[PDB]
Amino acid sequence: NCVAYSNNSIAIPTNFTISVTTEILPVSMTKTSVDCTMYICGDSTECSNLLLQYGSFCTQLNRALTGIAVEQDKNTQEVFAQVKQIYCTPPIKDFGGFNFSQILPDPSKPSKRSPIEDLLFNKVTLADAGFIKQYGDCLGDIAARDLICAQKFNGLTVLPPLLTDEMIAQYTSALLAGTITSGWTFGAGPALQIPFPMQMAYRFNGIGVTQNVLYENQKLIANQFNSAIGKIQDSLSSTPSALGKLQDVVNQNAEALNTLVKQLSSNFGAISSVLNDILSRLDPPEAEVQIDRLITGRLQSLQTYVTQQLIRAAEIRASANLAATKMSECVLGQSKRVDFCGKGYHLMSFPQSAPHGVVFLHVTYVPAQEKNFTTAPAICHDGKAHFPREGVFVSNGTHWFVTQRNFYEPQIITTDNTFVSGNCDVVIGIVNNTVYDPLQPELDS
């Protein structure tokens, strides 16, 4: 199905569809940390003294995991904490047909979480009986239990994030309110209010479609906008593979910890995999040799886990830097970058909070219902050559019109919408036609 090319026909779209495309990016990962000594030497002084001969290996590993855990707070701050003031949407939804109830918070819900973030939090689930959950039981929501709770799980510990899921949802609500009430202006300055139909009209004028297109099709565009967001909920529910990037992060971290703990069951060439038996069954001199084999194996296991987390944390940081760029350029502005903020011409985007991630709903303009018209580069009228100021010359078969590129709005060829340069003998493909002059009928009286 190739596109037929000819040197004098142009296909111009006579219609459009507004569409919404969902984008999901990870932002952070669970702030887990692992104590070197409690992992290698479980409540054991003989193992601790032998480990001291290895120098800074424990303290180096603790610094590495602590650094990763602090990067996670930075990632979340860089993405969501962009909004400086907590703006709020008006209680009345007289936006001119545009229904944002699917993305705005619900007062009826127990949490100020929108009906799309409700599906997002109910669809991203961590592993069943995973240490991330199991740690929540011995901790009992009491900070004082951390030392005892960490002792049970071989030194593994999970740290609470500096921004809770409730605070992160609050920031997206401010981002959403600012966008609907002030357009671009809350990202660059004070929040200059503007009616939403006029705001949307300037999104149209940005992609190169005149603003009168919106005001004359305002009801149809609002219906297209509402139906597109309505399809998002069904698309997310009926497809549980849409949150694969967020689950991938959670699964990779869970599989790392599970393997790290199971390494404690390996003998590593010693006489037994349990330190208590080596110390209670064997001669006191004969124990150091067996413990060294365990220490070497367990220290190498921890080093492997730490390096993997370092590489993976860098990968998530790259995704978090991208989410912050998409927040500024897709949500707080209108991007001219073609596939950055969705496919089609970018109109606007809406951030939605997700577990350790963000979801962007990119509203874009897609041309539809193309028709082919004969075209010419210029017009000969009085020996002079006339070029369109904006748009293209098209012919419906007998008459010539000038129309905008991205929508079929034909207009009479006039001195107002054309400019003159050169003469007829230079331009290749020039055509003879009349050019209307608004002053002549006034002088015709």
Epitope: N267, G269, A270, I271, S272, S280, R281, L282, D283, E286, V289, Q290, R293
Partner: antibody, heavy 128, light 107 residues
Framework: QVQLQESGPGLVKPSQTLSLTCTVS??????????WSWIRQYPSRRLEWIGY???????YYNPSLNSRLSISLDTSKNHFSLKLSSLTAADTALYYC????????????????????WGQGTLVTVSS | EIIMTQSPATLSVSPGGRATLSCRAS??????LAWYQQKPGQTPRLLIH???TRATGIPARFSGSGSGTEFTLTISSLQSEDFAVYYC?????????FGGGTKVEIK
Amino acid sequence: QVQLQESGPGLVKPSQTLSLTCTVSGDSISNSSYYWSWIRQYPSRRLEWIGYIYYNGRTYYNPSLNSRLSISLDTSKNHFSLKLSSLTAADTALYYCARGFLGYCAGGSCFLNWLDPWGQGTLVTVSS
Amino acid sequence: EIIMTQSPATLSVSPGGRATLSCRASQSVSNNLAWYQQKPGQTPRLLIHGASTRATGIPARFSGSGSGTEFTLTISSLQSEDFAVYYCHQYHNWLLTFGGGTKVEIK
């Protein structure tokens, strides 16, 4: 199966050296699966472990009599021996030689298993 | 050392009855226990090894149980020849040690 037979002087003067020999038939003392031990039994039915030697010659002794004791093996004749010095009247007991099974071994150390069988046992009297 | 205490120093059981013998360790000896039978003037015979694995050729009436610290040997049908001294023994630690022995008298 294996059979163990003790031999030694039944009457030894105090402050003399006791020498016991346990000849092993049906097995080689160099078999990697065994350790060979000495246990003495008192008239009060009390059993006391004296010491054992691995097939490769590694010896472990009871600290209660560590400074008086040595155990050795001879691969030519398949027997292991006990030498107990500084004998007192408290050393009068019934000395058994027994074959133990070695357990899991790694890195030059072994866990123990049970003793089976015991030798017939030789009675040693320490008196003038 | 792991001191091993056998609770009944002597036990009088009617023929055909049931005898229960207990052995207590000072610290966990795990499953590393054995029970030895010494008939009067004879060599000790291994009855049970591990916690409860009966040795080959031992009547099914001899049953051992326990783990960690408390262990129990039970004789299910006291024949006339089961009169002996029964020793528990631990091979958990190096420096293996024996209990005091229970003399199972028969009425």
